[PDB]
Amino acid sequence: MKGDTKVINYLNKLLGNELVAINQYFLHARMFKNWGLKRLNDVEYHESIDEMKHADRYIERILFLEGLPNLQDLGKLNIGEDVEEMLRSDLALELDGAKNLREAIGYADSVHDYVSRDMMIEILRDEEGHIDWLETELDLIQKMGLQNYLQAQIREE
Amino acid sequence: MKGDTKVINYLNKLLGNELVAINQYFLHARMFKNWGLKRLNDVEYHESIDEMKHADRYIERILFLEGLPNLQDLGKLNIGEDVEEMLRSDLALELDGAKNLREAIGYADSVHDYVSRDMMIEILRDEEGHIDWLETELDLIQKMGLQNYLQAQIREE
Amino acid sequence: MKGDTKVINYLNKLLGNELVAINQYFLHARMFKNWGLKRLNDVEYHESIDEMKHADRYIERILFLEGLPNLQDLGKLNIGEDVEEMLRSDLALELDGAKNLREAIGYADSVHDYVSRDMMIEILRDEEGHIDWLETELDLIQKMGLQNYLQAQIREE
Amino acid sequence: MKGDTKVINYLNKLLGNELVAINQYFLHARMFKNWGLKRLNDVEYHESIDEMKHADRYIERILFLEGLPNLQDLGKLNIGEDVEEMLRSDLALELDGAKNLREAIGYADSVHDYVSRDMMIEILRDEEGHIDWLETELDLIQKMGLQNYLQAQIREE
Amino acid sequence: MKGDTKVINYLNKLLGNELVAINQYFLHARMFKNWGLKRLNDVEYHESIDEMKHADRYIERILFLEGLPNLQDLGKLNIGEDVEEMLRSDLALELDGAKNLREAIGYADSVHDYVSRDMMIEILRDEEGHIDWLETELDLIQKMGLQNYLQAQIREE
Amino acid sequence: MKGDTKVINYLNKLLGNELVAINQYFLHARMFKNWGLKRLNDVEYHESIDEMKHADRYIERILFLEGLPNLQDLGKLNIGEDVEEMLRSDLALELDGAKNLREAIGYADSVHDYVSRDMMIEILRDEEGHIDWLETELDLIQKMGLQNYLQAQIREE
Amino acid sequence: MKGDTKVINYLNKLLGNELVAINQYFLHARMFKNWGLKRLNDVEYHESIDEMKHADRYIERILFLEGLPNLQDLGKLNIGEDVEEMLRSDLALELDGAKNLREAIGYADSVHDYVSRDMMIEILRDEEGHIDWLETELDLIQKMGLQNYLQAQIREE
């Protein structure tokens, strides 16, 4: 079903945001696992999977709308080298992506692509959940100190 | 454990190959799905997942060896626009990757990184399985004709 | 609860669209069944049932909103005499109905009837699924030819 | 128990026929498998296993009768390069083997080796089943054409 | 996938080794069974089956590599007439085959056919197991004497 | 089956490395248990058992190859007096043993003892896992401090 | 709890006896296994494991009593080269160990280390069981002759 060209361009931009997040979260996860921080591996792995599911939704929607999914352009990763830096980078990436979601959701409403909007609102809800988790963890590092915080990550939860 | 720098370089080059294949296979899968070719969606999706698993193994091994996984550089995709083209493109990608694996496996032996070699041989076995499947499907297109071939993809197997 | 009069007019228009679709899909289903095309009977039967469920939702919502559901006016059916024509007629009907759904969803937002809107967005998502299936089937007829296409319908899936 | 020398010669001749068939059917099976013709691999594999069971019966009977089983001489295989040729070669081999079975069954009756005869009649019944299947398949190739025939082999039955 | 011509010649040579062993083990097994030496029938039958599985692997690999499996040219059997002579012949055949495996495994590495090498290493492990069993049984004949040794074979283990 | 003398000597050297590690890990485990560090008792106990399984494999392989396993010479243990010292000693012992494994693995290939090599590669994989664990724990002591680290060991995981 | 220095010296001597026995029984077991004498492998393996459990008890007790377990000094093994010599060597080792146990049990009583004494009396019971088994087997070799004795070891019991 022929979709709106700019809606497809927004879907591709959002897809690109997910592609960056998949890679950044997955590498973060495996860094935490190498360091023995099992709890952080588990959460960041599942966030990577979430972003993969989002990417799939965008790819499927773009194809339905007769557009061309762009998996070729990968944007900048910001990996980081210690736990706080890694989490802050993930939070900044989520916030940037949420701004883009909000813009796309408004635009899709304007051109009456309500099913693409609906999909994007569900994805935004997921991202806000990730934002909550990241903000909270960052606060916990400050409140308990890094040594206690790292100890709290060695066992699965 | 401090690994061999050139082994790490190979692992990153192979990881790069997997990152391309993940995306190419996944987009191909969803293109087949959109077209109603369920059988091809199913196989290509699982090939994409296989390559994700390979990428994980490389990431984990690089980190163990105290190197930096590179998920930033994505090489060229070649998507294609019809089934035969798509399958031929996946086949050429697999064969390029197998050349690289053979080189890496010889080198790892020469510096006595036998565990990285062992890992890579298992991956190469996986890749040769993918090559067999692709070669066989391409021959089937020719033997039964494209119309019959497409009809044979519409149901799951 | 007294609803907005023009919301109710929209719900009655959409109900009208569903009533035409119920009958057109049902007759198509039983025509496919008569012809021995079991798979098309099954899909088209279940699309008819989907539209019945949508009609029920409209009737209940109209009554809640203190309007009068109109099941008396039936619009034009376009049955068709061969498989491709029948599927094309269903696709045209779905696309006309989607246009009407988009206008209703917009209008309901403007008068703050957000629950009628939510209902309608779910229904639109359903109809876009039907659109995807019909488009895909029509393309399959072309790609594999009508003889192979009809062979592919004789068994249930 | 000392058997009749010419009965033993017949059993060795028939064993020889089975040894050729085991190898010819097995290679055919794996050729079909390589080509993605799963249904033909399955049938031809099980025909190979049937001939292995027949060879075992001959070897055991010869030993009981105090003769020397000959597994050293292997007769001519005729592999073939396409499906029809391969099936025709199997059919010719089966028909040559049936002729030999008929002569052996007659001869065993004449010297009152009724248990060897009973064994051979069971084996002949098996081979006539294989003949029926091969004849039927070859006729199906002609009736539906080779493209449809090959399409019909790609899934297991 | 086109393989290296000399790798395929090695695989055919090894296949040839397996074809001889299949027949020699199977006849030995049934000779033991005729003699009432159940335990030796059981072991030798299962060794024959192992070699059948090895032959299958070679056939499938050769076909993948676009070579022609040779099941036509059966090498010399050495059956033997008493238990010790039979086991010694089996051992000599295993040792000859192991020499050939070692040569092939080195060559496959040199031309970077690492998957054919991996397969052959697994088969070599199997053959060394057979060698261990044979060497051990031959020593047991001498340690307990042949009358006790034969006694020890009449019941299954 | 007579093996290569130098391979047997390598296998005995490697066996010697395992015998030291069995004792060192076992004593470390029970020291951790005495101290109430249950998590460290559990891991180091299971590492000792791993090395016992490795020693068994070497003893079995050496005997198959007609050599004499040497369990008489025990090398130097370095026990240590506090958790970090104990773990660093285990790490140094593992790294020393890995060097010896790599040398033996290359030599076994050179003389075509591919089964001994396969065995040793599996053992090396196990050793690299122990190395990862030890490295990681040592880094965790530094990251969370010794007091928190010790607190993290008192409960089983 | 601060133990008596001389009790700890005895525990270390007994531990040393166990370490010799672990290695001697284990190697004996695997020699028997190599020879196909499965019953002897099974018994001698489990005796090795018994002595491992004894060693563990001594190590734990020594640590409780604030002594230093000595796993560094390994005493003389006497392996031997045929079944009778191997069992006689095991028996002589057991008898030597029982003398030391008796001395230690008396001493521990005299200094009121009744829990160490209780532990040692249980271990002595175990050793007298091993002594019974060994004496009995040696008598059986003589009574039935070595050829029959060896025959009786080839199956598990």
Ligand code: HEM
């Ligand atoms: C660094 C790159 C990636 C890695 C390491 C990775 C890793 C994984 C892993 C470990 C799984 C679970 C597979 C299993 O254990 O069966 C998975 C599944 C999956 N992947 Fe990826 N992936 C990557 C990129 C992608 C991309 C680019 C996409 C497509 C946009 C994608 C889509 C999916 C989906 C949809 C699943 C199934 C998730 C589910 O269980 O619902 N992945 N991936």
Ligand code: HEM
């Ligand atoms: C090309 C050479 C041969 C190949 C590749 C072959 C292959 C096989 C395979 C793959 C199996 C099943 C193995 C399993 O998964 O358990 C099998 C079973 C068997 N083979 Fe063979 N075989 C060959 C020759 C022979 C010959 C010459 C004999 C007789 C002398 C024989 C006797 C048997 C028997 C009796 C069975 C068990 C059948 C049953 O399931 O009842 N095979 N063979």
Ligand code: HEM
């Ligand atoms: C030649 C040296 C040794 C060898 C080859 C050896 C071998 C083994 C093997 C194969 C097992 C069974 C592992 C499994 O599969 O679960 C085992 C268990 C065990 N070993 Fe050892 N071991 C050796 C020395 C020792 C020593 C020196 C100790 C303590 C000082 C020890 C303590 C134990 C214990 C406590 C178990 C568990 C027994 C149970 O099941 O209760 N071993 N050993």
